[PDB]
Amino acid sequence: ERPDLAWLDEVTMTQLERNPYEVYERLRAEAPLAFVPVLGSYVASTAEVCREVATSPDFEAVITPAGGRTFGHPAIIGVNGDIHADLRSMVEPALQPAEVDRWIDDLVRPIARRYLERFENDGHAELVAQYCEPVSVRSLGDLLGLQEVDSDKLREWFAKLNRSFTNAAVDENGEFANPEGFAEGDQAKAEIRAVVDPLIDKWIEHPDDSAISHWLHDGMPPGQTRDREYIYPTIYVYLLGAMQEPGHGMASTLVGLFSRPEQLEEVVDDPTLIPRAIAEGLRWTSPIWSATARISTKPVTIAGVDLPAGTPVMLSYGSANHDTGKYEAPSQYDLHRPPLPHLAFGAGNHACAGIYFANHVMRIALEELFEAIPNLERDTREGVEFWGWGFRGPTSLHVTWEV
Ligand code: HEM
Ligand SMILES: COc1cc(C=O)ccc1O
C-alpha cells in the first residue's frame, strides 16, 4: 500500500459510478498508475500511461475480473495469440470500411426514420430510450442476424450485461463484494442462449448474409463451423458494448451540444460538422470509460511503479480523455477543439474493431434527428444524470420542441 494515496482506501464503488472524474483528476496528478482498493487493481488514468500499457509489448489483453465472470472464455477482448487472431479475422469482414460503405446508409437511415416517426410530432421525447438506444441496437441487431429480437429486449440485455460486467467492487480480502450482482448477467446470458441457439442451428445448415452466420462459416474447412461455445463470448462482447456504445456516444454528443447552444445551432445548420461533434462527444464522455484491461507478461516499470509479471492494469480511457497535458478545460464540451488524437476507441492490437461502423451509425442517427426536429431543445426542467464507471453515458435526455 502506497502511503500518500491512503485517501484511495475511502473511495467507494458508488462514488465512481455516479461521477469518477474528481477521483481521477487526483489520480492523474498524484499517481498516473495507481492501485485502487475497491477495484482490486492498478488503474491507468493518464493518456500517456493508457496508451503505453495498451500498446506495450510487455503487456497483453486480459478481461477485468467482473468482466471475465460475466463473459467467460474466449472473449475477443480477453485473449491473445492465435485465438485472438482467429476471432479478429472472424469479426472483421462486415466491419471493413469498403464493406460498411456499401450498405450502412440503407441499414441505419430507415431505422432512424422508423423510430423518429413514433415521436417527431409530439413536442417532447426522452431521447435515450426513444431514439439513441433503439437506433444503436436495431442497426447492429439486424447486421448480426437478430432481426427478430425486439429493440426493447436488446436494450434490456446490454443493461444487465453492463451491470454484471462492471460489478467490480472487492472487499477487504480482495473478494467480490457483491456476488449477487452477477445473477442478472447470468440470467441475460440464459435468455440469449434460448433465442440464439435456434438461430445458430439454422445458420449451420443454411448460411445467410448475417454476420453471425459468417462468424460460424468464414474461413472454415468445407462443411465445418466454429463451435458455438467458441463464439458465444464474443457474441456477448457485442451484446454489451457494441449494442450499447453507439447509443451512448450519440446521447453524450447531444448533451454536450445542448451545453453549448451556439454549437448545437452550428451543427443543425451545417450537418457536415456532425462527425467533428461526435469525436468531441466521445472524448468529453467516453462510452467505454474503464472497461478495458491489460496484464503484464514480464516485470515492467510503468509511471515509476515496478510491476511484477502477471499484474493487471485497468485502462481508464475516459479519464485519459480528460488529460490536461493534452486538452484545455477538458470537462467542457467544445466542438471547436482542434481535432487531436483520443483514446475512446482504445489503442494497439486490441483497439476497437468497429470504429468506422460505429461512427457512421452515430452520424446517420444525428443527421436524421436534426433533419426531423431542427428546433430540438433540451428540456431544462429535467436534469441529465450520467452514470457508470466501466461504461458511461446519460441515463436520460429529455428534450422539447415547438410543434
Ligand atoms: C461509439 C461506440 C463505440 C466505442 C466508444 C467503442 C470503444 C471500444 C474500446 C475502448 C474498446 C477496447 C479497445 C482496447 O482494447 O484498447 C473497443 C474493443 C472492441 N469494439 Fe468497439 N467501441 C464502439 C462501437 C463498437 C461497435 C458498434 C462494434 C461492433 C460492430 C465494436 C466491435 C469492438 C470489438 C470486436 C472490440 C474488441 C477488439 C479486440 O479486443 O481485439 N465496437 N471498442
Ligand atoms: C465492444 O464491446 C466491449 C468492449 C469492452 C472493453 O473495451 C468490454 C466489453 C464489451 O462488450
Query: In whole angstroms, what is the distance from residue 359 CA to residue 366 CA?
Result: 11
Q: Whose CA is nearest to atom 6 of ligand 2?
A: 292
Q: CB–CB of 26/42 below 8 Å?
A: no
Q: Whose CA is nearest to atom 1 of ligand 2?
A: 241
CB of 50 closer than 6 angstroms to any ligand 2 atom: no
Q: Whose CA is nearest to atom 39 of ligand 1?
A: 350
**Dihedral pair phi/psi, residue 174, rounded to 5°:** 75, 10
CB of 111 closer than 6 angstroms to any ligand 2 atom: no
Please report which ligand is nearest the Cα atom of 239: 2
Query: In whole angstroms, what is the distance from residue 64 CA to residue 293 CA?
Result: 6
φ/ψ bin of 118: left (φ > 0), alpha (ψ from -120 to 50), beta (otherwise): alpha
Task: Find the 102 Cα to ligand 2 centroid distance in Å.
Answer: 26
CB of 350 closer than 6 angstroms to any ligand 1 atom: yes
> Which triple of cell numbers denotes residue 378?
433540451
The 10 Å CB-count burial string (b at 16+, else e) for 173-187 is eeebbeeebbebbee
Query: In whole angstroms, what is the distance from residue 133 CA to residue 143 CA?
Result: 16
Question: Residue 296's beta-bridge partner residues?
Answer: 59
62 CB-side CA count, 13 A: 19
Question: Residue 305's beta-bridge partner residues?
Answer: 302
Which residues have a Cβ under 8 Å from the Cβ of 152 and sit 6 or more positions away?
none
Please report which ligand is nearest the Cα atom of 240: 2
Which domain range does residue 74 map to?
1-403
Q: Which atom of ligand 2 is nearest to the CA of 165?
A: 9
CB of 354 closer than 6 angstroms to any ligand 1 atom: yes
Cis before 198? omega within 30: no
**Dihedral pair phi/psi, residue 351, rounded to 5°:** -60, 150
The number of folded domains in the chain is 1
Q: How many other CB atoms are there within 10 angstroms of residue 120's CB atom?
A: 19
Please report which ligand is nearest the Cα atom of 320: 1
Q: How far is CA 301 from the centre of its chain?
A: 29
Resolution in A: 1.7
Strands 33-36 and 41-44: antiparallel
CB of 245 closer than 6 angstroms to any ligand 1 atom: yes
Q: CB–CB of 86/106 below 8 Å?
A: no
- Distances, alpha carbon 280 to alpha carbons 53, 69, 229, 338, 357, in Å: 23, 33, 38, 9, 17
Q: CA nearest 258: which of 344, 369, 98, 143?
A: 369
Q: CB–CB of 43/316 below 8 Å?
A: yes
